[PDB]
Amino acid sequence: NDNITARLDRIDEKLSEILGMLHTLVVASAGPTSARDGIRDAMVGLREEMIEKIRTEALMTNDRLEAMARLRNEESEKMAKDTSDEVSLNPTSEKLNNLLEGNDSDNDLSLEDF
Amino acid sequence: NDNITARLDRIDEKLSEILGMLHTLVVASAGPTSARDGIRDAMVGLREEMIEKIRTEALMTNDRLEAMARLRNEE
Amino acid sequence: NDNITARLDRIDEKLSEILGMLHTLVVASAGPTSARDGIRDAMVGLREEMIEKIR
Amino acid sequence: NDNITARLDRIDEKLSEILGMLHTLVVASAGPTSARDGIRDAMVGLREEMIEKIRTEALM
Amino acid sequence: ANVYLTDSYLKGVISFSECNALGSYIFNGPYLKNDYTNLISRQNPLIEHMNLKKLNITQSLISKYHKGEIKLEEPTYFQSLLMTYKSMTSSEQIATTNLLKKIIRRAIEISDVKVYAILNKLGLKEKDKNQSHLKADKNHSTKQKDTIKTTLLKKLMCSMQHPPSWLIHWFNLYTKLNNILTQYRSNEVKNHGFTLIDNQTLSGFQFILNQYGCIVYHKELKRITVTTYNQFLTWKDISLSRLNVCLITWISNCLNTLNKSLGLRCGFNNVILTQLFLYGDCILKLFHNEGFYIIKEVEGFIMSLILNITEEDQFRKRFYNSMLNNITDAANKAQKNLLSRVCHTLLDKTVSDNIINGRWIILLSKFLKLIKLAGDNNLNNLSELYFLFRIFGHPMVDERQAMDAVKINCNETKFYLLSSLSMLRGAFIYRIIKGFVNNYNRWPTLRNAIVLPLRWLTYYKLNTYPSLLELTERDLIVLSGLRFYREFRLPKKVDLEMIINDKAISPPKNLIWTSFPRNYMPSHIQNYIEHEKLKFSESDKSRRVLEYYLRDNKFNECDLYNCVVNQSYLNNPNHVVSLTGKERELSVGRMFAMQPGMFRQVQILAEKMIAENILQFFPESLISKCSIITDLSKFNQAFRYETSCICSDVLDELHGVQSLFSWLHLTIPHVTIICTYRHAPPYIGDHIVDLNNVDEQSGLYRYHMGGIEGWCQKLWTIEAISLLDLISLKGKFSITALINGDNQSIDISKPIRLMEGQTHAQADYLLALNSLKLLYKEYAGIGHKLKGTETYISRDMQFMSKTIQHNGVYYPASIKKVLRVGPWINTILDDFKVSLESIGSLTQELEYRGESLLCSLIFRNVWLYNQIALQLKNHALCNNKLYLDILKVLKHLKTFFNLDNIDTALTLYMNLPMLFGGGDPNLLYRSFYRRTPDFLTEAIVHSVFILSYYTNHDLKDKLQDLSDDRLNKFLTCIITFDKNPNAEFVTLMRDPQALGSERQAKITSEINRLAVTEVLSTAPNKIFSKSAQHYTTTEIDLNDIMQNIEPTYPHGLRVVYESLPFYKAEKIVNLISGTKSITNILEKTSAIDLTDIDRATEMMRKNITLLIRILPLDCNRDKREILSMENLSITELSKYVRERSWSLSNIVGVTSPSIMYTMDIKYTTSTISSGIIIEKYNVNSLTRGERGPTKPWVGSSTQEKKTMPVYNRQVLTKKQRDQIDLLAKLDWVYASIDNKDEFMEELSIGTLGLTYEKAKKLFPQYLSVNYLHRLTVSSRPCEFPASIPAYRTTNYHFDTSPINRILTEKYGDEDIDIVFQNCISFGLSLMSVVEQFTNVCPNRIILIPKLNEIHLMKPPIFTGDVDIHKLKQVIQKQHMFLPDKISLTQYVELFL
């Protein structure tokens, strides 16, 4: 059967296209506009123009670097640092760590001095 | 056998309309200045479709309650 | 066959439903200035229609 | 006829997925903006309770 | 003229804007932070600040400051000074040392009676197993042996004779600050508007103290500061907390020196504790106000120090490093914020050079090293080291800067992918479906059944659901699109109990300007206030809720259920949510919100519907394994409309209403969120009279778009659990969640053991890392970014409920709990009974958790003796009346018995129970078990045991001969008395345990009820007015209803009381009867009326003197016939008292025998070998803190067996099911009554719409014949636990057959009076206390009952009939509180 299966396959082609198009969507939350005097409605668009707007700062956002990398499915820097064998300490934290270890009683610290 | 194929053609035209609606939705909600200016200022016969869908839904909601009240009255 | 026509009807119902949902979406989002009054006027109209239909 | 039923079931399941996803989009699309214009009851529908109230006013 | 009684403790928050607005006026410059408060204060000074400055001494201080001889300062600096009170002469130190030695010697002597009684009844007199020097004294030993009869306390008293210095230090700080406070309070109650000026109480300081502000000056260092009254209360509280810590550690250390098991489980060297406190104050001084950030974040250090002991290497290092980094980040934030704040103000020079120099790191390091040393690598010391969180003061919290950060975080744009929200909603609806199927064996009704695959239609046709492991991802999206018909109905009449509460609510928007004082608001705003005040009603211009409901002129019961469905709360013109900084925690945290009243109704309703219906579906909400612990604060703001409302719409749809559970996100974005504290007014400009035109500032903002903390917490718990289900679906690991609303604990298991790669751990570590990656990704995809500060991973350690448990053992933080225990703790208008009750309760909590008896005992008696003897003179309302009355009672007890001195009278007074007007807060049983059905028997057994101290007794049985007849005289004086019964039946209903006939003292609600009734009679609300006017006669009818019936069962009367529509009125009344302000609510003044003070002091004097009335010395020759001591069953005596007091013929089923008096203790098995046997299966020396094999034991009373009918309970309300159950209990208990059919007819027709017969189809019929033994009412104790913590009970095992043998041979196979749970409970507690006292836990223990006191019990037969006319009148007079009537449509849809 050629004709019926051909029509069926055209149906399935269009249908899978629609399904992919739907899986692509991204929806933005409601919010206030710049020079806030009213609430803009929630807008839904394809991903690409959305990320373009995030990149060109058309919408007020706290952080933009994480959002675009997260939408692009890639693991950013912070995430890796958040999930690692160990967490890189700070310089001042290194001073605290060196002062905690090595209890040689060199503090020469007077309670009245502080 | 052939009526099957006619039904499949009906399904094909319906899915094509659906795809057109999807494109229209995404491009209308994506359009930066196409929302206020360059607006369709149209879709009045679609409002009637949506309101009649809500009408049929409201009747379907109201029909089940009326069975219960009439059963209360009879029993 | 019987299974074939039954499933064709069910698929037709699903198509009608998705068409209705697409309709309400595309009409709700497009224009604020018109819908803001058109839809609620039509809603109070539907309310009056229900009152008169039960009456 | 077997392949007919199998392909029809595939189409059925995929249509169901489309319809569910579009439904959740419709629901989450009401939002605090449409509540200003009173269009919310339009998109999400009319539930039982209020309609029953209407029925009361219909009888008196 | 009215008085103004002030708080004795903090009971509130310290303020920031208050200190600022005071200092800016006094010193004519910005004091704490440059802000609008300084401008508006200098421009328009307030009244009370004008009065404070108007004084002459503060003007001298200002003049001395302008020249530059003194320099300004920060309140925390003076905190640091006051704490290190170096200036102490010799004479005051000697006086305080003598006073402390006295308090100690007196507190050790009072507990001797209870310890002696315990050691007798235990039979443990034998094998009990500086101090020696001062024991070997001649005269000191004689003076000790004068009144102490137990060597165990002779040794301890001798050892505690020389107290250390730090104890004396904190003691004198406490006494001096306390003296200043009480002197001010007394003089303020006397003369109004009084300011206290003192410069000689605390050596070197100078206080100018007042209700509105305080000024402290120190000359030798020439510093001055300005603070608020709350700040001084806080300084007092800090001194008190440190005093308590020192006392507890002192007693525990001496006791533990005696024996290893007596004291608490923790050891401390108080020198380390003192250095620790001092370094804390040093940090607080270095960082002026931002030091509390550092002190907060230090909390991670103790968790890390525990993980060092309980965790493998990787998690150990990971947590260590994260915690260090968080501490240092906190410190840097604090420093920078301080320098920014104090840049341009008066306190610009005070910033030390050690901040800039960079040398605070050495100080912080020393502080952390001191904490590490005080821990000393022990789990106990580290567990109970949490109190450091509490010692230092609470921070000065500022309103404005607390919102701005929340603003930056709150209103923003979030992006989600459609699949994420879709799968979330799919998981939600899956959970609801699973709940319906597993609960009602029925799938919920759907309207969109067409959209469903065949593989799911086959799941619908047959009522069953697919399991979780089979379920896939894509299927969830399929399940995302469905709709539901109504399943749960909505209650129509407002429930008045849940809604009324004393908490405040904001005024409507147009009137909100009436929160700020008259002075601060400009001219035109005041003109508008005055011109508009009339437009609104008198109802809503109310500051609190009690007033709001007591002034409703048009108040309809159907208004709420009409409004929630008409959608009037959306798009409302006057809606404003105002944040107030009254949330109390160590960090600044947040500040809680208040709406108008109507929206508060709607929000309470939403939460109530969820809690009633939905939360029953998510029971979680209150072999590679990994637990993950997450903080859940700031989880609210990340929510937006989509994320929450997609899941909320399902509940909204089930309930059939529209936009009920979605109100929050639908109306909050429009309204203007402002801060409303009295001293923090936002700059209004001009020509602006409403909020929607005011220009945004640091104070108020708009467009929130996010949850507000606290509201709709249940929605977020539910949706978090659903999202977590989804995570488990994507990650493929068996998951489990525990959310209490403050910390979310997620544990994970995966079956990849035996498949490991070359390591048995460090693979679950990789599981942890992978799962955490997935979880971060998921929560971020939902829109709530998860920070590395909140979450942490563990394997064997789990912090739950702020309680530490490791290896199945519990570690208690008691010292935190008993930290503040003082003279007038937990009082309302300076009570005596309530104070003693609260002291008793807190210290008994110490004894239940900390696992030490003698410590709790001595520590309770210290503060009891304090409040009784030393600080009872200095009282607010009455100068010396209470001291005079207690002196009378002591002289009376001295004459009645043969006590030598008033001091011994005070001993025997502090040991007598409070039921007889004594001073013992908590009876002698509470040590051994927690609950009992009756109190009077325990009171009598306790008094017998206590009197057994002065008169020698064996306590193994009743001695036939008593040379000293003190006990017998007491008994014969307690049995014989007059009869004056009035209103016996209604009283027996309200309190089933009552005695009556003026043999027991009256509590405050009973006294104030009449005044509350009268003031309620004149209330503009028709409901309260009618139900108050008719309140008197309903009592008479209720009294007459059950009068005719001859045999009287109290609990049955209790059910009769609960079924009738009088319970809710009594509740609403005795709710109001608890507040200090009565007869004055309608006049809207905080001050109280004098007649209330008069009734309070009169009732206090009477309740104090009660003991004379109970125990009069006159009936010695009036009635010389004394009862014999031959048999003397005490249960008979208690029944006799309870019957004679009410003069009734017979009262049945309310007197359970005292298990302490019943059983006897024995160790060597006999030929009898009867009684319950308790043996420990583990073999050790000391089982304290070591877990055993068996499962724990909680005593669960025998249930009641009932057959439930077949119908759908879903379509019904909660209150209706409750009432049907009550009526079922009535049908069960009153079958013998003759009016049954008529009486039940009237009850069913009155409470419900149904007639009786139809109604009978719903009554679950009970199958148990004996209701005396098996019944369920709010008056009866439900479970009978043990004192010891749960984990210890696992170590033992109990066998109860040998006693059952004799209990079945005589009076066989019938119910008996004694309740069996308390037997084994007392056995376990007995094992524990024996271990404490002898230090070697016994191998086996056996309990033999006493065959006398175990009486019979049989289901009685009732006789007489009820009064139906008066019952109908009761139900008619107060009909507003009736539960909703079951309509006909509801009943017809019931059976389907």
Numbering used by the authors:
A (entry chain E): 128 to 241
B (entry chain D): 128 to 202
C (entry chain C): 128 to 182
D (entry chain B): 128 to 187
E (entry chain A): 10 to 138, 167 to 659, 692 to 1461
Study text:
The catalytic core is a 250 kDa large (L) protein that catalyzes the RNA polymerization in both replication and transcription, the cap addition, and cap methylation of nascent viral mRNAs. A tetrameric phosphoprotein (P) is essential to modulate and constitute an active RNA polymerase with L4,5. Here, we characterize the structure of the RSV polymerase (L:P) using cryo-electron microscopy (cryo-EM).
A total of 2600 movies gave rise to the final 3.67 Å map, refined with 253,372 particles selected from multiple rounds of 2D and 3D classifications. The final atomic model contains the RdRp domain (blue) and the Cap domain (green) of the RSV L protein, and the oligomerization domain (POD, red) and C-terminal domain (PCTD, orange) of tetrameric P proteins (representative model fitting with the map). We have assigned residues to domains as follows: RdRp, 1-945; Cap, 946-1461; POD, 128-157; PCTD, 158-241. The RdRp domain adopts a conventional “fingers-palm-thumb” right-hand fold as many other RNA and DNA polymerases. POD is fully assembled into a four-helix bundle as expected. Interestingly, four chains of PCTD adopt four different conformations and interact broadly with the RdRp domain of L. However, the nonsymmetric structures of PCTD suggest that P likely plays a nonsymmetric structural role more than previously appreciated.
